[PDB]
């Protein structure tokens with residue numbers, strides 16, 4: 002007989018950065 | 025491949041060859057001296073230089089097993105799989121025999137562990153560190169790396185025992201050797217001179233030369249099969265190579281008219297250090313680098329810079345004045361540093377900074393954000409032009425129309441030592457002759473009369489007149505006739521006023537008196 | 539030209555390999571086929587496969603997966619290398635190559651298998667794609683794919699028609715030239731759907747294939763001297779340069795149809811066209827103009843219609859601010875990316891404005907953009923008659939009164955007049971319909987003169 006198996010590895014996220022303006 | 029298939033990278037190739045083969049050829053020497061040899065190399069340089077070719081050649085010349093690992097290939101999204109891939113690769117390499125592991129583009133899988141956010145990157149970094157160093161880490165197997173930016177790697181990876189050796193794989197003789205070795209298997213011709221190729225292709229990395237040769241060889245057959253013993257008398261000629269190059273300016277000491285003394289001085293000061301390094305080493309002194317041009321606009325300063333850049337085998341990086349400033353904090357200085365790093369990364373090179381009045385501006389004091397930005401830009405330029413550098417071969421050439429607004433730190437000797445002034449009918453005759461080189465002319469036209477009626481025009485005005493004459497000739501067609509010049513002469517511009525001429529004369533007189 | 543190029547590239551390295559070896563060049567081995575969909579890349583692949591008795595191992599894109607994709611790639615390459623000097627067709631490479639920025643493993647396998655072909659293999663590869671941008675530059679590197687063709691008609695459409703419909707009891711009164719002429723944009727499969735729907739309509743006709751079946755199967759499927767010189771001048775400039783060798787730009791200004799003239803250029807000039815608005819393109823503000831002109835020079839020839847030039851140039855001068863610095867950088871980018879156009883790559887910039895005062899004389903200089911086209915009653919009558927083409931007009935109506943009353947107007951506000959007349963007629967129709975809730979199908983089927991006389995009140 003056969004059998005199943007579960008697997009959950011990872012995902013992908015998004016970050017936000019701040020910049021500085023010298024006019 | 026083999027050791028004979030490598031050219032130009034002579035010293036680094038020899039160093040890698042000895043450090044890899046001496047353990048393999050005979051380990052008795054290292055047993056006698058009682059020290060283990062280095063077991064890691066970090067190659068760095070621009071892409072397409074021949075680094076993986078060198079690794080493959082060394083692996084072929086020795087009884088090794090070249091195993092290639094790509095950066096993006098091994099990285100995956102699954103958890104605990106990329107590390108398993110690296111472990112399996114190392115186990116395979118160590119299983120069979122003493123081998124060479126070439127892991128390409130490690131910078132993609134070595135993000136310094138601080139600027140990254142994905143846990144898989146840190147995990148594979150740690151796996152690499154454990155594999156290279158640790159309990160029974162390596163047993164007679166060497167690893168080779170490759171990257172474009174060696175800075176973006178873990179400090180733990182640039183340690184001894186992992187990447188103890190760093191090799192810089194970045195000239196004319198190497199380029200000629202590559203040309204010779206890439207055309208060894210084809211009979212090109214009898215009148216093809218490789219000196220022009222080694223002098224004209226002055227910006228080729230080395231992998232582009234193979235593409236150039238293949239393209240020329242393919243185009244030779246492409247042009248020699250439209251109509252068609254045929255195998256006899258086959259091969260490429262100079263025309264095919266020129267076409268391949270056509271598929272970085274086109275001037276040679278002819279498009280510039282007049283200014284003979286300026287031409288001679290520039291030619292001497294630029295060609296002497298390039299042609300005779302031996303003489304300067306005997307005299308034990310460095311050459312002058314900087315030249316500044318000032319005068320009215322549209323006089324031919326860019327043309328002169330291109331004309332003095334072309335005869336040498338140097339590159340040419342022309343940047344406008346305001347073509348680098350940014351609204352952000354530290355972007356202009358980053359651009360300046362990148363420009364100079366590129367300029368000194370391919371020696372010799374001439375850098376043409378245009379409109380210094382926009383960059384220098386005589387920083388002094390302005391009390392503003394723009395003032396601070398100008399101060400920082402000026403300081404960065406000052407440090408790069410003459411600072412904690414090596415000044416191998418860099419020829420900064422300046423060009424502005426308002427030298428009075430330059431700080432006395434860039435005009436200082438050693439940065440822009442030569443203060444050349446660029447200012448006649450006899451010169452205008454030469455300018456017209458150089459402009460009308462390849463043109464069907466009429467015997468009846470007299471350029472002397474045209475030059476006599478200028479009385480203070482610039483080369484831009486002469487080019488405008490020539491363009492109007494060409495437009496009239498094309499309008500008539502749809503040789504150049506005299507009436508086109510007659511009707512185009514009336515519509516003169518004379519964009520340069522008189523007060524600016526007085527200002528330039530005063531500046532030149534003050535400089536001469538100083 | 540593309541057929542002659544691909545015929546040379548599939549005949550000369552495949553029949554005379556010894557001659558190819560004799561030259562001493564071993565690069566031709568990979569050909570790429572890009573372009574818009576429905577042009578005939580799969581048809582050229584089938585013609586290549588049916589003009590040669592060589593082996594033909596077709597492998598499509600997503601049919602390679604099930605560690606067996608690498609085994610499938612190695613199996614296909616060793617099968618094509620083992621039998622004969624042959625050709626491999628890899629259709630829809632955009633699924634296998636995901637531009638890289640098990641897919642990484644199969645891309646690395648295709649890279650190391652395309653590179654590992656020696657002189658004794660003598661096999662070439664052909665690959666078709668739909669979009670030309672989502673391909674690896676490592677796949678477009680020197681060694682695998684360098685010679686791409688750009689397959690960018692009525693005779694081929696007649697050939698496809700005579701290929702498909704010749705296997706049916708067709709008719710006795712058909713002219714397939716008319717079916718090839720009236721069908722304009724179909725490609726490959728839509729003509730097959732046309733014949734299939736013709737058969738379906740014939741079966742629907744004889745249940746409750748003549749020309750009429752194909753007819754509604756096609757129907758049920760999917761400033762005179764100024765325009766003469768402008769069109770004529772553009773044609774002469776983009777024509778053969780041999781006359782020019784023996785011996786680009788334009789500007790509109792006025793109070794009239796300048797953007798209308800640019801639209802008429804954009805439709806009926808037989809050249810490419812790329813248009814941007816005025817302040818639409820505002821380091822990123824220079825990178826926008828840089829890659830817009832890169833897109834222009836890539837698809838040569840083209841027309842870059844810069845609408846509302848004053849907003850961009852503004853005659854840089856002195857403004858002394860952040861807006862002044864942005865204006866100076868925009869003007870310098872435009873000047874240094876237009877003056878670098880030689881006789882090659884033949885782009886052509888068309889400008890239009892309302893205020894010609896505020897344009898920069900540094901952009902009105904000779905050598906960059908020197909022409910100055912200055913831009914009536916008959917054109918107004920023609921504009922009103924062209925706007926009212928597909929409109930049920932009232933028969934007792936003349937537009938010469940609207941042409942004579944309106945003097946200094948323009949095409950956009952003439953469109954506004956026609957749209958206000960349509961709005962008033964729609965209001966009358968919905969009011970009559972709710973009042974009726976029998977009249978005809980429409981109580982006001984045509985736009986009367988009263989609707990125009992009430993719509994011109996607020997014009």
Ligand SMILES: Nc1ncnc2c1ncn2[C@@H]1O[C@H](COP(=O)(O)OP(=O)(O)O)[C@@H](O)[C@H]1O
Nearest residue numbers: 029030031071072073074075076077230231234
């Ligand atoms: N020094 C060299 N000698 C001979 N061939 C070279 C050299 N440098 C580059 N090449 C050519 O460039 C091609 C690919 O270069 P490669 O070494 O893969 O680039 P990279 O250095 O980025 O790995 C090879 O086929 C090789 O013939």
Ligand SMILES: Nc1ncnc2c1ncn2[C@@H]1O[C@H](COP(=O)(O)OP(=O)(O)O)[C@@H](O)[C@H]1O
Nearest residue numbers: 279280281321322323324325326327455483484
């Ligand atoms: N002495 C000269 N001989 C030939 N052409 C010239 C000369 N001076 C100027 N020109 C022409 O006029 C133009 C001058 O532009 P450029 O030198 O870049 O401006 P600037 O002189 O302000 O640096 C060039 O295109 C060049 O062909």
